[PDB]
Design an enzyme around this catalytic site. Structure first.
Site, mmCIF file in Angstrom:
data_model
loop_
_atom_site.group_PDB
_atom_site.id
_atom_site.type_symbol
_atom_site.label_atom_id
_atom_site.label_comp_id
_atom_site.label_asym_id
_atom_site.label_seq_id
_atom_site.Cartn_x
_atom_site.Cartn_y
_atom_site.Cartn_z
ATOM 1 N N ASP A 1 0.877 -1.193 0.000
ATOM 2 C CA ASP A 1 0.000 0.000 0.000
ATOM 3 C C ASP A 1 0.903 1.228 0.000
ATOM 4 O OD1 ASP A 1 -1.880 -2.117 0.661
ATOM 5 O OD2 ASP A 1 -2.986 -0.806 2.064
ATOM 6 N N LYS B 1 -6.869 3.320 -2.877
ATOM 7 C CA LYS B 1 -7.159 3.301 -1.448
ATOM 8 C C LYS B 1 -7.347 4.725 -0.979
ATOM 9 C CE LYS B 1 -4.895 2.152 2.869
ATOM 10 N NZ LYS B 1 -3.814 1.393 3.549
ATOM 11 N N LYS C 1 -10.100 0.246 -1.766
ATOM 12 C CA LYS C 1 -9.916 -0.003 -0.332
ATOM 13 C C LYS C 1 -10.275 1.265 0.431
ATOM 14 C CE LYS C 1 -6.515 -1.274 3.229
ATOM 15 N NZ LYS C 1 -5.223 -1.848 3.595
#
Ligand SMILES: [N+]
Lengths: 225, 225
Positions: free
Chosen positions: A92, A158, A188
């Site tokens: 991430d 995300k 996400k």
């Protein structure tokens, strides 16, 4: 419309505090395994600790360039590489939010591309810091950054680091992201998701993964263990 | 006991927000020049912008491993090296706070040493995150981390990132740091220093450099330009 087991299967159970110790990470993995979540997410120097105790079937995510995004591309890319070597299977990464606000989408692209190519076999999530993009610019920039991430080969967009003062996930951001790239990328939702009501709102908006630190309280809001 | 000129000569005028743009940094440098401060401090990807507009005499500090400290040594060191190549003359690195709290001071030493060796000609400041060390452990740990920084060749110890929830500089922290290593190392007070009164308290406690984001308001409290 959401069972506890369904939700758990899309949770990344996370600890990213600067003060986190190895013992905190082994406790995180024990909690993640007990809850039956998809993944644990940890900081780069703690990946090896997580990998050493995680059962097969619990994925390991690491953050790169985190939380600020203020690292040159080659540093983000090498950080990602090293975390995969240490046992992460997902990364991430945080964009350079200022580059995006400056309209330098070519720089944002180059950054994501550097990381993508360093960890070609990993699942790559791109943290766009949606609350900041929406506060300081607006919806068009958020949508455009998501397109940049798609075109650079990201697997997920995300919402949030959980460390920026503009805030965390919002329904508005998740909807924008999902409408822009959700046919091809996962979405996400992360940052400030403390209750089942909030988690459900994000999933209904189009999130396909949740980043949680208080996963047990969220899951208990969906039903009993 | 402090003139404006004396204080300015020990200020690092700083912008580290994730959303900072190149133009924000150009403005920062102009302000630093107008105020007559010692240095500006910026994030690694913005060093070259700062260096490209900095007048003669203005030092450039870059942060490394910042703000979390949660980066492996090889990444902190390479980040530092790249920032020096971009124009930095000083590096303010963050320790792994969790390593310190776990009692793994050998790991903290190895991290500082890696950075030190990568930027041998730079001024190296080590951010100990003193508010966190004090909150989660106490005074002995703060002193011990300062001893580690000294022994690994740092030029300065520095209180704070300004991003940790435990807080920023305190008189208590500065006094401990100064007692422990102030005969050999500089002591930089940072995080939350908004007024002349606060700045003077830190200087009186033993700080020899100040990290400020609102430097004009601090300096105006000491008197006119
Ligand atoms: N000194």
């Amino acid at each position: 419309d959401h069972t506890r087991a369904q939700v758990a299967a899309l949770v990344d159970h996370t600890l990213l505090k600067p003060e986190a110790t190895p013992s905190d990470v082994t406790a995180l993995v024990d909690e993640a395994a007990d809850l039956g979540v998809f993944a644990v997410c940890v900081s780069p120097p703690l990946v090896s600790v997580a990998a050493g105790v995680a059962p097969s079937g619990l994925a390991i995510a690491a953050v790169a360039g985190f939380p600020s995004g203020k690292h040159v591309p080659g540093i983000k890319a090498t950080e990602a590489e090293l975390a995969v070597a240490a046992g992460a299977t997902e990364i991430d990464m945080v964009i350079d939010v200022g580059a995006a606000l400056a309209g330098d989408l070519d720089a944002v692209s180059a950054d994501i591309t550097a990381v993508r190519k360093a960890v070609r076999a990993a699942t790559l999530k791109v943290i766009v810091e949606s609350a900041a993009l929406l506060e300081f610019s607006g919806e068009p920039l958020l949508a455009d950054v998501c397109r940049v991430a798609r075109d650079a080969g990201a697997d997920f967009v995300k919402t949030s680091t959980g460390f920026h003062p503009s805030g965390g996930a919002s329904v508005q951001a998740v909807e924008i992201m999902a409408r822009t790239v959700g046919e091809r990328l996962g979405v996400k939702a992360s940052g400030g998701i403390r209750t089942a009501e909030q988690a459900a709102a994000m999933l209904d908006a189009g999130a396909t993964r949740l980043g949680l630190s208080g996963s047990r309280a969220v899951l208990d809001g969906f039903g009993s263990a």
